[model samples]
Target: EQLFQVSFVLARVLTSGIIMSIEKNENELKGLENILKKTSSKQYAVTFNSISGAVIGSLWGQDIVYGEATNQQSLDEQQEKLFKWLGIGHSSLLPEPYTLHAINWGNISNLQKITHEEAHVTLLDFTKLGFGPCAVLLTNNETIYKKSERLKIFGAFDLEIKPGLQFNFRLSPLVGACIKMALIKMGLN
Candidate 1:
């Protein structure tokens, strides 16, 4: 009798596209291109640097997506709750003030627009909030769930986002811009 053993290996692959490709010959072909980069999932919370607390809502294209004000937790608790929720100690990897709910590269342009308009799109993928500067919350409050609730939180890069949908954060125009600026470099803008 005989016996045999077999094994298989699987590798993870990252998918990306070439923005430019060309062909050369007696006659030549060329192309120009741009990219819509997919962003990693990100999170954001609203702050009330300018306006008074009411409801946190987001804008998509030129319309409002949804609004809610169900953050049962008080502002006093947000700071502490943020660190514990993300479970990382303060280090070079953790940006000050802004924690896990930070923006990624894809939304830089829209992030610019919202700040200029000074609109607040208070959003934290995992929490329901109202009042005070944006902070990470411990969990999502299904009580406030709505369809476009995550439009801004996801940094306007999700497949569901439309061509014109603008990605933004909640709170004052100037303050929001400044805060987002802190998170990014000017060259990127």
Candidate 2:
């Protein structure tokens, strides 16, 4: 096995349950259970930890599952809109295209957003995207767990998960150009 280190974002699901309430103007945001079940049918296995509300999930066929701003406020909207500029109002072949299909089906975990007021400054952060030992697993490969043998987890980058950072992997020469173009566009921003 090879040792692999990488940076990633940890996120949680927001259920309009006791832990949180819907937007003051909106009805509700589906909870974790429903999200996971629906995501499972969409080729993802959403493993959620209730005690901590740490949601770890994976998509089988999707190129990548990136994190985004999920709050209902303009702050969230602003960031996402900036991202949409990369997608250019299209839902396909764009870096941050309107991912309604993914969000609706649970491929993405619309994490709970925390905004607190301190004198007029709003501090924003996420519930928790697990860290170090608890980092989200992108793959649920069963072979790794079928035996009682030592295992090594490898990530493409030997870095810690930090904000505003992104990574891309090209599986074959045929797809490299498209992936490269996407990265180039994102780099301009």
Candidate 3:
């Protein structure tokens, strides 16, 4: 297997229950599960870990691949509205280089709005366009689990069991650990 390295952000179903709730929020920001990485191959590879909450937590891929932000005009038409809902108001896209869909399901009557002090941000289906992961086989913790001769577990990224969500694979544990190790040896984690 060829070693591949990348990091990807965690998504909704990975945090929310895949259904709008009267309570609770999808909080992936600042969590350890946001980034991911793994080995790559002919459309198959071993995923070491991820930080988002979703079903099946993705597996080094997606059946559909999209290009970087496009000027398709219709691209991200409702961005301002979404950032406003999260109380962020004015961020067109995350400064992290990748683009995320920002849909607003409009009028989520089931939940209560949290004040400014609230950190657990709630988002709606309108904020998330594509499907989410239904389960996670990998994790942001641990590495190399040998499950007998038939299934040799090297790493895992756990997508909280929600459903229908996925992301661009960008980071990997093999890369994560190495960066931290290098930093820690130089004083960082």
Worst 10 residues of 3 by lDDT: 141-150
TM-score of each: 0.20, 0.19, 0.20
What's the ranking of the predictions by lDDT, best on top? Answer: 1, 3, 2
* lDDT by residue (tens digit), candidate 1, 1-189: 001110110010011121111111201001000010111122322232221111222222113223311222323355335334333233344222211332333443353332322222322321221212432221122222232334334432334324333234433322233333333342322
> Candidate 3, TM-score vs. the true structure?
0.20
* Cα lDDT, model 3, residue 149: 8
Kindly list the per-residue Cα lDDT of model 2 for residues 19-90, writing each as its tens digit.
222123221112222332232222212122221111101111122224432222222454345434323232
In order, candidate lDDTs are 0.26, 0.21, 0.23
Clash count for each candidate, listed in order shown: 8, 4, 37
